[PDB]
Design a protein around this ligand. Structure first.
Ligand SMILES: Nc1ncnc2c1ncn2[C@@H]1O[C@H](COP(=O)(O)OP(=O)(O)NP(=O)(O)O)[C@@H](O)[C@H]1O
Ligand SMILES: Nc1ncnc2c1ncn2[C@@H]1O[C@H](COP(=O)(O)OP(=O)(O)NP(=O)(O)O)[C@@H](O)[C@H]1O
Ligand SMILES: [Mg+2]
Ligand SMILES: [Mg+2]
Ligand SMILES: [Mg+2]
Ligand SMILES: [Mg+2]
Lengths: 278, 278
């Protein structure tokens, strides 16, 4: 049940994929269902990332259909600021995603090192991110999981959107995380609200805030308090956040999704154009 | 922060409550934040249930405000088929709910013993449940957690609705269980859909099915499959479920909440009146 509408054939980086095509290196990270390994295609010596997923853990979590969406959606996207998915294959026990290797790690880790980004580094990242999301949204795809952990850095330090495991086509009501006993709840208590590409515009506004401040705007001790802060749009600005940054953040963190700007208004925002290098 | 609009004064079952007012017996059950104990008020020797909740665990889960709703809502309800909450009190570390003692246990356990209920036992329970939910809904309260574990049995074998920890006033969009990182999700991805008292009509239909069949209609191996079965109303009937029972169940398990019958149509349904003893 692992036949996707996505490439599975050998690629000459200089016949179906096989595990014997790859040399394996250090783990680049640990996912929930397996590790992502630094890898190399043997013939071309091309460096890639090999995401290994265990079929047993995929099925016990019932996530086999969202994996299909991740593979099919990401493999058909071609953008300099989006992580390539060159193809996939599977054997008896594992599924392998052949991913573009991002050498400079996650924006999450870079934010940990630098504590907070200056306005120019932030505006440049937001330009790259808005460009990539514009391309994603032109395909009617919602990423729905935009956050520093899922933003990788290319060899030139540019942003690469990664982790399309939650991506869907707009509009959608699909949930992302399900917890608790559902057996007795009606549909109106388990189904998510209808949402579209404006979801990623909100996440983009959260990123502008955390890039400049060093912490997310709705941070709280419990899930419930964070839930209320988000639902009621309860956040405040430290005094060092400039007026132009406060304007862009406030325009993006709108409870009404239709009131959030188009990505082109973000790219042309005065604070962005004044501080971005791209 | 544990001052509720609910009784906290001593009651003569034959001055504020104190833990010294009660003799403690065996645990009647184990909740998520503490045990429910068989207890006895010393002066009157009146047998009750003492629900003990640890403030430290309540706050680390951020559930202090839903506890207020549970205490305030349940303590103002007076119905023979609803578990009384006589009052509450708290000390430095714990909150105590003084509950009516239900001698014959949960419907859950009775269903485990009998495997499945005959049509007459089922119809009688549904009559008692519909009567109690009619009273609850007359107060514009949604229980939102109707299931066999939360239905207790009085000394005469009658149903008693229990566990109002999820109860709210209609209409509502409050979630019941929150899981996963919310920090980057927009409101439309974390907020629940608007719902009202029709929620409990769906749960009632699930109960009719499980009472007669012995298993819930949307049972599945994963949360995701169960989610899809509920959202798409995917269930089938074993051949022994009679035509009248199939009619009542199908009328209640409507995806559109407004298409579900009033509780009075349930109480007057031909299958109910033909088989209920109440
Ligand atoms: N192409 C890549 N290049 C470099 N590092 C990568 C790449 N893909 C993944 N990683 C690293 O591996 C980690 C886990 O990958 P990820 O795709 O997020 O797994 P996941 O299970 O789908 N999501 P997560 O729960 O965060 O692990 C990431 O946080 C990165 O640090
Ligand atoms: N008044 C009562 N009389 C008799 N048994 C009771 C009473 N209240 C609770 N119990 C038992 O104690 C168990 C736990 O009580 P409950 O009120 O459900 O705790 P909870 O944490 O709010 N929900 P749960 O997660 O199921 O424990 C129940 O399943 C019953 O078996
Ligand atoms: Mg991730
Ligand atoms: Mg993920
Ligand atoms: Mg319970
Ligand atoms: Mg409960």
């Amino acid at each position: 049940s692992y036949s996707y509408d996505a490439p599975s054939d050998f690629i000459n980086f200089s016949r179906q994929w096989a595990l014997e095509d790859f040399e394996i290196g250090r783990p680049l990270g640990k996912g929930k269902f397996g590790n992502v390994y630094l890898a190399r295609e043997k013939q071309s010596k091309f460096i890639l990332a090999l995401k290994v997923l265990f079929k047993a853990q995929l099925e016990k979590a019932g996530v086999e259909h969202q994996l299909r969406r991740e593979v099919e959606i990401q493999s058909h996207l071609r953008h300099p600021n989006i992580l390539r998915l060159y193809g996939y294959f599977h054997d008896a026990t594992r599924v392998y995603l052949i991913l573009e290797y991002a050498p400079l790690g996650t924006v999450y880790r870079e934010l940990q090192k630098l504590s907070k980004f200056d306005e120019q580094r932030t505006a440049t990242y937001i330009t790259e991110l808005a460009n990539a999301l514009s391309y994603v949204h032109s395909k009617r795809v919602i990423h729905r999981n935009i956050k520093p952990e899922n933003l990788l850095l290319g060899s030139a330090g540019e942003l690469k959107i990664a982790d399309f495991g939650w991506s869907v086509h707009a509009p959608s009501s699909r949930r992302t995380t399900l917890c608790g006993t559902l057996d007795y709840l009606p549909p109106e208590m388990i189904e998510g609200r209808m949402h579209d590409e404006k979801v990623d515009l909100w996440s983009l506004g959260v990123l502008v805030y955390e890039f400049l401040v060093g912490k997310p705007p709705f941070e709280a001790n419990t899930y419930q308090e964070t839930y209320k802060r988000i639902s009621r749009v309860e956040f405040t600005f430290p005094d060092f956040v400039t007026e132009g940054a406060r304007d862009l953040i406030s325009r993006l963190l709108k409870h009404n999704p239709s009131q959030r700007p188009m990505l082109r208004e973000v790219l042309e925002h005065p604070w962005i154009t004044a501080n971005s290098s791209k």
